[PDB]
Amino acid sequence: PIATPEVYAEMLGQAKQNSYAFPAINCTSSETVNAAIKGFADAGSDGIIQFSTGGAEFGSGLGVKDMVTGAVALAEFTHVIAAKYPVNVALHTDHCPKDKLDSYVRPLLAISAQRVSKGGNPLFQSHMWDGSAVPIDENLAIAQELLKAAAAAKIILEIEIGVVGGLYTSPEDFEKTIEALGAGEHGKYLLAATFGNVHGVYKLRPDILAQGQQVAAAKLGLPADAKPFDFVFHGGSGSLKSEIEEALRYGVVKMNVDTDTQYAFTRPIAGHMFTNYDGVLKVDGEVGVKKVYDPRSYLKKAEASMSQRVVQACNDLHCAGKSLTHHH
Amino acid sequence: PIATPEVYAEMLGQAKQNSYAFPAINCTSSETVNAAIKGFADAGSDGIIQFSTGGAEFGSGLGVKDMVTGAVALAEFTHVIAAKYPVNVALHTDHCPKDKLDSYVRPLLAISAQRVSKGGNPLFQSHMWDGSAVPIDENLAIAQELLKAAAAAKIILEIEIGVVGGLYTSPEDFEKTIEALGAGEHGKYLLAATFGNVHGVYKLRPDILAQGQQVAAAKLGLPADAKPFDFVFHGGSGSLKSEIEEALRYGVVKMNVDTDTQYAFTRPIAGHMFTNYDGVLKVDGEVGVKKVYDPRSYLKKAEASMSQRVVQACNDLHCAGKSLTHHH
């Protein structure tokens, strides 16, 4: 099923408690959503499906190019599909900068607030505010008001302090975050801190995350080994095993996956076109071969390949076999 | 917007009155739905989007393979998208044989009956019962009870008498159809008659349709030039202009398109893979090129190409520039 707000909070709390994380898979379409959920289900895992600003725009079609429309359309599709699987699937929106808040996150929050007001659950279970391009104080002022709106709609907020590529987060940056937002008692939030992490597969310092947890623990009057933050790891695709393991130990509960699942989705499509070149093209006066230019023929292979890569992510992040539905 | 039942009936009545038809485009995904609606909008035309049994199964994903789930999921997606376009888009389900009625058309009718009972509109605006593999009397017995259910849910039924490939419909076959179902007063229906028409692009007798109209007119006590039937043309892709024109004159209001839009969708994907071969594949120890293995890069080209082919269909069937919303 779609993760209820209660289930999603429990997912993240269990991940943190047990030092594992969920892959958050960027999707752009019915096929990619289907591949992701099938991957989670094959791994006996709960998981997160996220739509970026560009993914949402693509989802809305070339005739619309509207982020809210695309996100809502894909979310409505995902609600129907996820009801047929025995794992929990949470819906999330990815990086939204300041000048897109009024055209992405805010209208989506408003839609969910309306659902909640009528006794329903929110359409998305988390939204990202990406304030890494603005000064920390401005970032956290926006985060504070968004956290209030988000919590009131039963939604978890993801925020980012410092910049993802494609200087590190200071102890004071971590300190300000705890001071402005608390440690979950004013609403759950996820924190993307910057520790040398980059988008795309081509100098990670996971110790920055360990430092953030210690700085927060000291601020809160907690034991030295406490982990007050739930961290998000941006630029997950292409990471070393030892680096992932360290990140998990320091409280990463969500790792974003996009590049690696894109390659997995495209790879069998390329193979299909090449081996069926004279079927997918009308060559030498012939009319091609409908059975191989039927989009389903190669898109089913793309779906299966992407699902395999998602299963790998679940095993790498150690959430495989741990779905809170306990289908074994 | 999505066509209301009232708008859809008006679409078909206007098409018939003015000797034009709508393309009914088989879709299987968010991308293909988006391409189809953009095509209708670019042509200033209303249109129909249809899901086959196989398309619905594909839409539900490899982990589900459930026709109802896929149709509902894609219909919910389409409802969100179509609200953003200034043309009317009707949703239809394609060929459902006897042994799939209980797992496709009937549950979908039930969903729409529930919506209507609550003061809403049906999820789909038409459903096809394909009884061409059973004897005419059995076909029409099923059609009669389905027409009653369909009309009660504000849904148009499509039926088929005789077999589409990939012998012709007799005057008595046409006669039995009028006798069992009437001429619309017991609920609107669309009729696929068989006149030498075949699925897939590789002996049409459109005069069979003219004969059916005359046989029905005589039965009903109408003038010789009356056209009591609203016909559906199966195997639209790859047809001659002169054959389409004749079909339109005899009351074809809906022409099914699948093969031709499949080729249009796939063609730029193939081109993409070939010209970006060393970007979509990791070759010679290199890591490929994310900007070209990102599915959006080639799927946007696929969408645009499919939309162009849909525009061509609207111009071929003469529904281009005739949307009942009159945006000019």
Place this chain on the structure above:
Amino acid sequence: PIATPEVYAEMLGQAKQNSYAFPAINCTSSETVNAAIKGFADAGSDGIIQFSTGGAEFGSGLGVKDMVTGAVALAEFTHVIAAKYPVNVALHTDHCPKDKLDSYVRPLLAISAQRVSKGGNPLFQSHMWDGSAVPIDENLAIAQELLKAAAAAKIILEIEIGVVGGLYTSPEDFEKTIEALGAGEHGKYLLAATFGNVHGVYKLRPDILAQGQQVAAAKLGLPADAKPFDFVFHGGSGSLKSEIEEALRYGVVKMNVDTDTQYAFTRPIAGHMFTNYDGVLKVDGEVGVKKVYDPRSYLKKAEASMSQRVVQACNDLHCAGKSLTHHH
């Protein structure tokens, strides 16, 4: 075997007498020479293999780029191969303009004159002087001295009056040609006249050739139906059957083929690369498949395909089954 000068003259005389022609296939390599000779042999036909200036340069390799070297190297190769076939193969050089005479045709003539002086046969059996870019009088002055040199080396000269693309040859142009060169008694020559013919496959006037024959016959005091000229048809690839037939009737004895055999050679290579994409490329960390990146694997397919196209040319030009060796 390689055509002796005596056999070559007999080939052309028989072609003219019986209204057929030989394909003259542009070759650039051991593979293309092999494909051409196999094509002639499969068709039971004699044939011509020709090297262009660019083909000769390519034959000499990127480290040499010398037309004489490439032509000699490929001619020496062809001499060895043709000795193993029961058809006659003549070697020819294609379009040589004025500023390349001193670096192609003249040195090659000199090589053959040396062979003949020692009691041997010439290396090539014909050479083309292409003077179509210079005024007719200058063209024919050069042709006259080259014809003397060529005849002394037992070599047939091909000349061109008027320009091949990618205005027509006048009666006076034809008249001047007979006046300057005679009708074979001062050495055999072949004549490329311009009648709307073009290089490459994308307004032919074969009657220009009929007119030339009549003009020459009148000059020579011959009957009206005499054909004093042996014509060459440039731009043979992609020609209509009716146009070829007419050309043959008017004394075309040689039709140049390049574009069509190039496509035939390349087509299975392309097919090979696509269907073996993951064998001819090292993909995803794999090491490819030696059996399909071995050049012989696809070059044998290229050879066979080119040979098939040459067989087609022999049947189109009606020289198939007419080899002067009479192997039946």
Place this chain on the structure above:
Amino acid sequence: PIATPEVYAEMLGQAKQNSYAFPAINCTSSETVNAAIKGFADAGSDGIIQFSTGGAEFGSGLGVKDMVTGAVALAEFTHVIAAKYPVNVALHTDHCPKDKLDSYVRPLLAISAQRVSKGGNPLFQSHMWDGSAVPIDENLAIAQELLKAAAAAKIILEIEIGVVGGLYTSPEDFEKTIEALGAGEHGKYLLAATFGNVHGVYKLRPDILAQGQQVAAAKLGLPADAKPFDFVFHGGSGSLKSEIEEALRYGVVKMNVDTDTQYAFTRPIAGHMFTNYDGVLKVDGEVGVKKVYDPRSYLKKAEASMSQRVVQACNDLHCAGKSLTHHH
């Protein structure tokens, strides 16, 4: 130029004296010969071009399939080309087993004996007798009579003791070889011994070669560090640097290269077909693009790429910059 027998012997003697080796490149065509010689010339190196039984058969064309014909045809071509380069190029025939001696090596030896009898040089400068499938005594009996014939025709014989894949050569095997053939005083020979070496790129014991040299030195009454054998390294493509270096130290003077140059030749052809897919194929009723289906367009890229790989071989084997013509 082509290596004279005197120059070839000097090449191998200098290689041995200075612990370097020549690549021996398998060629099958005018293009591959041209690529190889250009590679040697670009590296300022002398080199060897070899034709296998299969390469020779391919060289003769599908209509002939005769090893002698193909080898002679390609050798005659190579003689013309090599005269235009300022490095020495030796011609060699590769693996000939017992049942092919009468149809490859022996007739070729006979051709060269005829040339030598008339005061000329042999057509090939070395021939391989591959007796690795027969018992050592039989191997060496054949080798002894072939060495006599070869030396009389000014030709170096290559022999093989033990089997190349795709057990090691014993001290007695090495001993028998010296006893039967001497150490060059009865004619120069090259020795392929088996030390865990395999054809094709996917447990080398170079110390077997060191052992052979010591065993031979002891037999001959020479100092312990003497290297009486000139070794040949079969399966050169895909070898480690450290393994090549060791082999050179123990007297390898010739390293066979085939797989690696095949990949280099094919790789840009594949790239060409993919990026020009709609030019090399007639697609969607179009007629393709002659400039890219012209075989020269991609074969020039193949030639250049293969030449680059040959340059790499010359640098790996340390013969680069050491041509005995001393063009610097």
